[PDB]
Amino acid sequence: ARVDYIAPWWVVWLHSVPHVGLRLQPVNSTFSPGDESYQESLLFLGLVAAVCLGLNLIFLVAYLVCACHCCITWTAVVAGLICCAAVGVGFYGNSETNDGAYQLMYSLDDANHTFSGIDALVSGTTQKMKVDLEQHLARLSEIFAARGDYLQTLKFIQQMAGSVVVQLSGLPVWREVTMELTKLSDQTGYVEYYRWLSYLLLFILDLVICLIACLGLAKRSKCLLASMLCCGALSLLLSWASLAADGSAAVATSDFCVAPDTFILNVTEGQISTEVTRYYLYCSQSGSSPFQQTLTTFQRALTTMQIQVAGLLQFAVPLFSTAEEDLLAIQLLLNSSESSLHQLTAMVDCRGLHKDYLDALAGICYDGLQGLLYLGLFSFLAALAFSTMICAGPRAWKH
Amino acid sequence: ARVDYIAPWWVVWLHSVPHVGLRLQPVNSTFSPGDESYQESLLFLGLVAAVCLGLNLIFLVAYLVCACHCCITWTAVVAGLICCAAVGVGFYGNSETNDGAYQLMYSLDDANHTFSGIDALVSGTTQKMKVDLEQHLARLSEIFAARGDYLQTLKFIQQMAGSVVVQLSGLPVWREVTMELTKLSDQTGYVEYYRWLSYLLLFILDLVICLIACLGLAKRSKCLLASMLCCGALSLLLSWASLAADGSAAVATSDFCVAPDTFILNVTEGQISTEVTRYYLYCSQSGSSPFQQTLTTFQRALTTMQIQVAGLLQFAVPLFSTAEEDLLAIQLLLNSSESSLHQLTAMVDCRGLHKDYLDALAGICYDGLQGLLYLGLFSFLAALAFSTMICAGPRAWKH
Ligand SMILES: CCCCC/C=C/C/C=C\CCCCCCCC(=O)O[C@H](COC(=O)CCCCCCCCCCCCCCC)COP(=O)([O-])OCC[N+](C)(C)C
Ligand SMILES: CCCCC/C=C/C/C=C\CCCCCCCC(=O)O[C@H](COC(=O)CCCCCCCCCCCCCCC)COP(=O)([O-])OCC[N+](C)(C)C
Ligand SMILES: CCCCC/C=C\C/C=C/CCCCCCCC(=O)O[C@H](COC(=O)CCCCCCCCCCCCCCC)COP(=O)([O-])OCC[N+](C)(C)C
Ligand SMILES: CCCCCCCCCCCC(=O)OC[C@H](COP(=O)(O)OCC[N+](C)(C)C)OC(=O)CCCCCCCCCCC
Ligand SMILES: CCCCCCCCCCCC(=O)OC[C@H](COP(=O)(O)OCC[N+](C)(C)C)OC(=O)CCCCCCCCCCC
Ligand SMILES: CCCCCCCCCCCC(=O)OC[C@H](COP(=O)(O)OCC[N+](C)(C)C)OC(=O)CCCCCCCCCCC
Ligand SMILES: CCCCCCCCCCCC(=O)OC[C@H](COP(=O)(O)OCC[N+](C)(C)C)OC(=O)CCCCCCCCCCC
Ligand SMILES: CCCCCCCCCCCC(=O)OC[C@H](COP(=O)(O)OCC[N+](C)(C)C)OC(=O)CCCCCCCCCCC
Ligand SMILES: CCCCCCCCCCCC(=O)OC[C@H](COP(=O)(O)OCC[N+](C)(C)C)OC(=O)CCCCCCCCCCC
Ligand SMILES: CCCCCCCCCCCC(=O)OC[C@H](COP(=O)(O)OCC[N+](C)(C)C)OC(=O)CCCCCCCCCCC
Ligand SMILES: CCCCCCCCCCCC(=O)OC[C@H](COP(=O)(O)OCC[N+](C)(C)C)OC(=O)CCCCCCCCCCC
Ligand SMILES: *[C@@H]1O[C@H](CO)[C@@H](O[C@@H]2O[C@H](CO)[C@@H](O)[C@H](O)[C@H]2NC(C)=O)[C@H](O)[C@H]1NC(C)=O
Ligand SMILES: *[C@@H]1O[C@H](CO)[C@@H](O[C@@H]2O[C@H](CO)[C@@H](O)[C@H](O)[C@H]2NC(C)=O)[C@H](O)[C@H]1NC(C)=O
Ligand SMILES: CC(C)CCC[C@@H](C)[C@H]1CC[C@H]2[C@@H]3CC=C4C[C@@H](O)CC[C@]4(C)[C@H]3CC[C@]12C
Ligand SMILES: CC(C)CCC[C@@H](C)[C@H]1CC[C@H]2[C@@H]3CC=C4C[C@@H](O)CC[C@]4(C)[C@H]3CC[C@]12C
Ligand SMILES: CC(C)CCC[C@@H](C)[C@H]1CC[C@H]2[C@@H]3CC=C4C[C@@H](O)CC[C@]4(C)[C@H]3CC[C@]12C
């Protein structure tokens, strides 16, 4: 996030996970969220998690049957310790995933603000030029209907304004990209809020299950032991479902993060020029800005307009008592236009947008991927804890 | 960060904590890190924690004496649960404080990069203009020692180059601010890494102390119980020291975070112009820029020089077969200077620097202050856990 984006070792490893599709068919592991084969590979990872959950349940049933048909305190304490470690790791991973999601949201909002500002500046300058300059120049022409030189100067000012308007219209329009960014930010906020809440409820339920199981064991209550066995089975189901979700999300995120610029270029094509997208995506210092010529022509037109207006003031104003207010209004408009041009040349610069892109990449890849990995670790630990507790169940019942 | 800065409720609360010094005389709570009254106020905040530790030890020893002269399993399990909770909260606080410190270092490095780039642009443009433009114009004058008009054009180009150099020299120089930023970033990295390692070691020591206490209780070893009592007393002392450090650091950070712009303006009084500092600190689109006139003059001089060079090319290439290479070199130099002007006007813009400032504020205040409060909570939790463990120790020793 400081110089460039390099795919971390964990991103590379997760991307290395084979994508197999439902019927064990090799699937191309390039981020294609809209591709049926890619979605099938993610579903296959989820299905492998489901098969592992089924194996866990089968082993638990076999062990319970063998124990009933055919240490307790220490196994209970070990299960409680593993559950506490799992809940701590889950809290950490949940917070890290929330941090990554909020970093992505912040980068999307910053890019949205920059693009909306570019659009507002271009629209405001265009409206100012056309409407206000035309009105003031019409008034000045009506008051100056005696001097061919002055009329020609007004015509030159109008022509320069037209050139400025053409250049401004030649800049990218970011309305569609801004709508996409706002929609993505809203969806990310919604989904992240509900994911964080769901994992927090899972941690609370696991902690209460562990504490209630310990209390039931202390009080020697068959009702409490059976209720905690049922809750442990339900939490084992939830833990395996969570591990499936975390593994699939980690593999998809790693697929994206292994090559994010390729996906951005692929998905933006047709709505953003390749040169503009590459300018914002690579922000190479030794490179030519796609907007440099537009900005140069805009500022040259503004400079010529100001020179003409200053000459018109210093000459005509002594000759004509009136018409000074219109010239002053035009000069103020051009001063505002120069300020707007400086703001626009600052906004269209690749540095800020590339910083937003790199911050989003850092958030997603580093923070979010690590949070998803820690949530998968929590899921595995909770499965292990609620499996060992269920295994010790029958022995505790007997003794 | 995502918006402007407003002091959070916990920042306001912590800043409200009374500042009294060693003699209890009232002390101004404004952030003055170099002021003896303020440093003494922080020292008193630490001395309060030292007195609390003394009272805790007094109570522990009194209870131990009374029990020896005049529930064990459940108290031990409760102490172990509280120690696990404290270590979890401490892990969260350590991670959050590290995140805040790293965010501050990231903002400092981004501001350092921006200011260093501004300095590089200004220095390179100045050197290019004077050295290269003057050498090329001298060669052109030597090759054009026949045309008074062409000599006057070369003189005009030299005068415009001098104007550009003067305008560039009128901009702020960020060498001192950059050196201060690098020093602060390096010190922050050093202190943060060592603090994080210290708290990780403390968490691991607490965990091993609790686990070995439980193991010694299981094995019914008197030596293990005595060793765990001694290590629990040592960890209680470390926890009280950590609480004192966290409380003092949190109060100081809150004092800063209440008036960050005021502190920055005070501390940058003699090294940065007040208008420049306020421009970067407040970044209001309503107001003007302290560099707008400089940039406008720079670009107008560039445009005049470009027009002169183009006219000279057009009206002298047919007349003079030579000098074409020198004219093309000057034109390329001016093209590069236009690119540098656009880069500079994007760099000096307040948006990026204000984003860096607000991100450092978000990091420090929100993340670091929350992490410090969590570390203080961990310290109190560990003190409570080890106090309960020591209190329950005598019963196990007798049993
Ligand atoms: C939250 C974690 C992050 C990632 C989450 C997972 C991402 C994907 C989730 C669902 C996306 C919809 C998938 C539609 C296309 C599937 C691939 C495909 O259509 O290819 C098909 C998959 O087979 C199918 O039955 C069609 C698709 C069945 C979809 C089943 C939907 C289950 C939904 C449960 C998932 C719950 C969470 C997600 C809910 C939306 C391959 O054809 P075949 O081999 O089976 O035919 C073989 C024919 N012989 C044998 C004669 C040769
Ligand atoms: C056992 C532990 C498991 C924990 C993880 C799984 C728990 C659920 C997590 C998220 C569930 C989605 C949120 C509730 C469903 C709302 C749908 C609805 O109702 O339709 C709509 C559509 O929503 C959406 O825009 C987003 C579409 C959500 C569909 C995505 C399904 C796949 C999710 C994959 C999750 C990957 C990350 C997890 C990896 C750990 C909800 O209303 P709305 O959006 O139109 O209103 C507000 C309008 N805005 C959003 C603009 C403000
Ligand atoms: C984007 C910028 C990066 C993020 C900026 C936001 C927070 C930066 C760090 C704030 C906490 C620093 C804690 C220092 C504790 C030691 C104090 C000390 O002892 O020596 C400090 C000096 O050393 C520092 O302060 C380091 C300064 C670091 C900032 C350098 C300028 C940054 C802003 C540039 C201008 C643009 C405006 C901002 C937008 C970029 C003196 O203060 P004094 O009162 O104690 O002595 C009294 C002596 N007089 C009276 C002369 C002050
Ligand atoms: C908890 C999350 C719930 C969501 C899970 C959603 C799962 C997807 C639902 C639809 C899929 C479905 O119904 O299964 C459909 C497929 C059937 O295709 P086939 O194998 O190729 O059989 C036909 C054979 N042909 C097509 C070649 C002719 O399954 C399977 O037989 C997959 C068999 C391979 C299993 C390998 C698993 C190895 C596990 C290793 C553990 C370490
Ligand atoms: C044994 C599993 C226990 C865990 C269950 C967790 C909650 C499940 C649903 C609760 C919310 C709900 O109410 O479901 C609804 C939601 C959305 O779908 P929708 O109904 O069509 O909303 C739109 C249609 N509307 C508007 C008419 C309702 O579904 C989900 O996206 C939840 C997916 C849970 C995935 C967990 C494992 C994922 C494995 C992925 C491997 C590839
Ligand atoms: C600064 C560099 C230039 C940036 C230009 C703006 C790019 C906007 C990207 C819109 C993505 C989109 O379109 O939505 C995202 C799509 C929607 O899902 P989908 O429908 O299945 O995919 C569409 C497939 N189609 C087209 C075949 C139907 O995929 C995703 O959800 C994953 C989004 C990954 C996060 C990307 C954020 C990268 C950080 C950027 C911070 C500035
Ligand atoms: C063992 C019982 C559980 C212990 C729980 C507490 C400690 C957990 C690990 C701490 C060490 C650590 O933090 O590992 C650090 C790593 C990497 O991060 P890095 O340090 O910045 O990279 C440093 C790289 N070097 C060293 C080369 C410079 O983090 C992670 O990628 C997430 C680790 C969790 C992975 C769990 C797998 C989940 C799989 C499920 C989905 C497939
Ligand atoms: C998690 C880590 C976050 C960052 C923590 C960085 C701490 C060290 C940074 C500067 C170190 C330094 O400069 O130490 C040197 C400084 C001053 O220097 P002096 O030469 O002695 O001044 C001469 C002495 N006068 C000024 C009296 C004449 O000593 C101190 O002020 C000691 C008290 C500072 C502790 C609290 C200040 C910062 C609190 C945090 C508010 C955000
Ligand atoms: C306001 C209330 C605060 C409460 C106290 C909180 C901690 C304050 C920090 C002071 C830092 C300092 O004292 O200095 C840090 C010291 C001195 O470094 P040095 O020997 O000179 O370096 C050598 C010169 N080199 C750098 C060139 C090589 O480093 C140390 O080795 C001590 C580390 C102690 C770590 C464990 C803390 C023990 C605390 C015990 C309390 C019961
Ligand atoms: C084994 C068991 C492990 C348990 C681990 C527990 C981790 C808890 C993670 C939950 C995160 C969360 O709930 O949010 C943490 C919250 C939300 O802050 P925010 O959302 O980030 O932003 C700010 C959003 N406001 C503005 C709405 C708040 O912070 C806070 O309000 C700050 C309060 C800090 C309390 C610290 C204790 C104070 C008393 C001690 C003083 C010395
Ligand atoms: C009784 C068995 C308990 C086992 C507990 C093991 C904890 C040891 C952690 C070592 C990992 C490490 O080395 O660091 C700690 C790791 C990694 O942090 P990070 O993201 O990389 O920070 C980066 C900082 N840098 C950049 C400077 C490197 O944080 C975690 O994984 C979260 C663990 C949650 C707490 C787990 C237990 C909490 C309750 C325990 C009750 C039993
Ligand atoms: C992204 O920027 C757009 C503007 O381009 C914001 O859309 C405006 O939102 C405000 C506040 O809700 C409305 O009053 C305006 O009417 C909206 N304008 C348009 C053109 O839609 C949008 O809120 C921003 N999104 C995010 C997530 O920050
Ligand atoms: C802040 O930027 C300065 C440049 O202004 C960096 O200083 C350079 O560091 C490199 C790498 O160590 C050296 O080769 C250069 O000689 C340094 N230049 C100067 C002028 O000192 C500095 O490293 C940056 N600091 C941080 C923390 O990123
Ligand atoms: C540790 C985190 C960060 C990364 C994920 C680690 C695990 C789950 C991943 C990373 C790399 C993966 C391996 C990559 C390549 C292969 C070869 C293939 O023929 C069988 C699967 C196998 C052997 C994968 C198994 C799962 C694997 C070990
Ligand atoms: C992050 C988590 C979910 C990763 C889990 C990786 C699992 C799904 C991967 C790792 C190794 C993979 C196997 C590697 C090789 C083969 C042999 C091939 O002839 C059929 C597919 C099969 C049998 C793969 C199935 C999927 C597999 C088991
Ligand atoms: C995040 C924060 C809120 C964590 C907890 C901070 C607590 C300990 C702080 C915040 C505000 C503080 C109070 C602010 C003002 C006063 C009035 C004074 O005459 C006695 C102390 C007293 C009553 C302080 C006691 C400590 C206090 C309650």
Numbering used by the authors:
A (entry chain A), B (entry chain B): 4 to 73, 88 to 416
Please give the exact wording used by the authors of the publication that reports this structure.
TTYHs constitute a family of eukaryotic membrane proteins with poorly defined function. All three paralogues share similar structural properties as homodimeric proteins, with each subunit containing five transmembrane helices and an extended extracellular domain, which mediates the bulk of subunit interactions. A distinct feature of TTYHs is the wide hydrophobic cavity that extends from the membrane towards the extracellular environment, which is filled with lipid-like densities in all structures. Here we identify APOE as an interaction partner of the paralogue TTYH2 in endosomal compartments.
Finally, we combined the large particle population that did not contain density attributed to APOE from all the obtained datasets to generate a structure of TTYH2 at 2.7 Å. In this high-resolution map, we were able to assign residual density surrounding the membrane-inserted part of TTYH2 and filling the hydrophobic pocket extending towards the extracellular side to phospholipids and either cholesterol or the sterol-like moieties of the detergent. The distorted yet largely continuous lipid belt reaching from the outer leaflet of the bilayer to the hydrophobic pocket emerging from the membrane implicated that there was free diffusion of lipids between both compartments. During this process, the predominantly vertical position of lipids in the bilayer gradually changed into a horizontal orientation found in the cavity. This transition is presumably facilitated by the N-terminal helix of TTYH2 preceding the first membrane-spanning segment, which is peripherally attached to the membrane and surrounded by a lipid-like density with a horizontal orientation. The high-resolution structure illustrates how the architecture of TTYH2 might facilitate the extraction and insertion of lipids into the bilayer by providing a suitable pathway from its outer leaflet towards the extracellular environment. A role of this cavity for lipid transfer was initially proposed on the basis of the presence of lipid-like densities found in all three TTYH paralogues. Its relevance was further supported by the structure of TTYH2 at high resolution obtained in this study, which revealed continuous lipid distribution emerging from the outer membrane leaflet into the cavity, with the protein facilitating lipid reorientation.
